[PDB]
Amino acid sequence: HHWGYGKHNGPEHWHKDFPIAKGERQSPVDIDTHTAKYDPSLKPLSVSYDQATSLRILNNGHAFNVEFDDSQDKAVLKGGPLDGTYRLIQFHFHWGSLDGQGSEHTVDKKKYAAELHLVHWNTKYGDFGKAVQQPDGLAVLGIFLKVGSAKPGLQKVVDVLDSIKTKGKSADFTNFDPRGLLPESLDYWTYPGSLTTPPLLECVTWIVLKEPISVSSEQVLKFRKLNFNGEGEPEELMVDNWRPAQPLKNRQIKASFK
Numbered sequence: 001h002h003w004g005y006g007k008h009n010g011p012e013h014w015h016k017d018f019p020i021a022k023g024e025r026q027s028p029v030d031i032d033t034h035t036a037k038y039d040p041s042l043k044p045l046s047v048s049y050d051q052a053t054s055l056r057i058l059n060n061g062h063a064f065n066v067e068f069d070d071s072q073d074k075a076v077l078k079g080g081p082l083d084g085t086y087r088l089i090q091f092h093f094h095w096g097s098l099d100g101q102g103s104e105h106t107v108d109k110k111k112y113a114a115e116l117h118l119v120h121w122n123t124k125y126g127d128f129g130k131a132v133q134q135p136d137g138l139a140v141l142g143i144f145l146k147v148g149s150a151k152p153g154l155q156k157v158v159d160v161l162d163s164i165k166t167k168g169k170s171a172d173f174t175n176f177d178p179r180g181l182l183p184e185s186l187d188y189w190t191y192p193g194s195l196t197t198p199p200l201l202e203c204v205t206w207i208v209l210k211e212p213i214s215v216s217s218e219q220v221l222k223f224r225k226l227n228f229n230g231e232g233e234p235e236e237l238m239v240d241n242w243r244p245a246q247p248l249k250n251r252q253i254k255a256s257f258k
């Protein structure tokens with residue numbers, strides 16, 4: 001499969017190889033804050049990242065992933081809409097060529113400069129590959145980024161990007177603390193959805209934080225210097241690696257707050 005974010009292989013084309021692209025619970029979506037229903041029955045979110053073990057950062061030609069040791073319950077997400085324990089496996093971002101675009105979710109149609117996805121899988125399914133075949137297999141925690149002041153907790157990520165410029169490159173990335181990427185508030189919206197990249201599997205409980213984090217212009221500028229291409233190939237800047245909002249169809253977005 002040769003999917004991407006260009007005119008000839010971008011989101012509008014994905015349905016040809018991945019028909020589920022036109023499915024009933026596709027992501028991302030627009031979050032209409034005036035339609036989302038406060039669900040007083042949602043439990044508080046439990047983000048338990050103290051024992052998180054980062055390993056490696058990889059440019060996969062679509063984004064970069066920071067990978068974690070998920071062979072044990074080290075870094076987990078519980079509570080909120082979730083039943084059971086979801087293990088952190090990686091995080092990545094989507095971002096734009098310009099500060100007014102880049103997020104995949106939107107809020108009342110507002111696009112943010114970027115969006116952070118912390119990907120977790122349901123341990124009841126034993127491994128990630130099994131989990132993605134289940135309607136409740138994954139929980140992705142989505143965090144918006146807006147351009148303003150620098151995010152100190154992001155800088156170690158920013159500084160290693162020069163070493164993974166092109167597709168297939170990876171670098172050691174141990175001892176990174178993902179807690180430094182969280183906003184103060186854990187207020188969130190939640191809805192059932194999908195992976196936002198092929199194979200677009202409908203296996204995700206989305207948890208999208210209401211409070212964005214601020215990153216500096218210089219920080220996101222360094223995201224934009226990454227390459228989609230591999231080494232020794234013509235340069236294609238890794239920018240605008242976001243899927244646009246998809247039809248909500250028969251889904252309700254629930255809010256953890258009023």
Ligand SMILES: NS(=O)(=O)c1nnc(N(Cc2cn(-c3ccccc3)nn2)Cc2cn([C@@H]3O[C@H](CO)[C@@H](O)[C@H](O)[C@H]3O)nn2)s1
Pocket residue numbers: 065089090117119128129132140194195196197198199
């Ligand atoms: N925009 S977002 O909604 O959030 C995401 N969009 N894609 C994401 N991942 C990549 C992925 C993998 N698979 C998949 C399909 C069939 C069988 C198995 C996996 N679908 N999407 C999440 C993700 C997966 N992995 C892989 O998981 C495996 C278990 O560790 C192993 O092959 C590697 O470690 C790693 O490549 N990494 N990330 S998330």
Ligand SMILES: [Zn+2]
Pocket residue numbers: 092093094117196
């Ligand atoms: Zn993502």
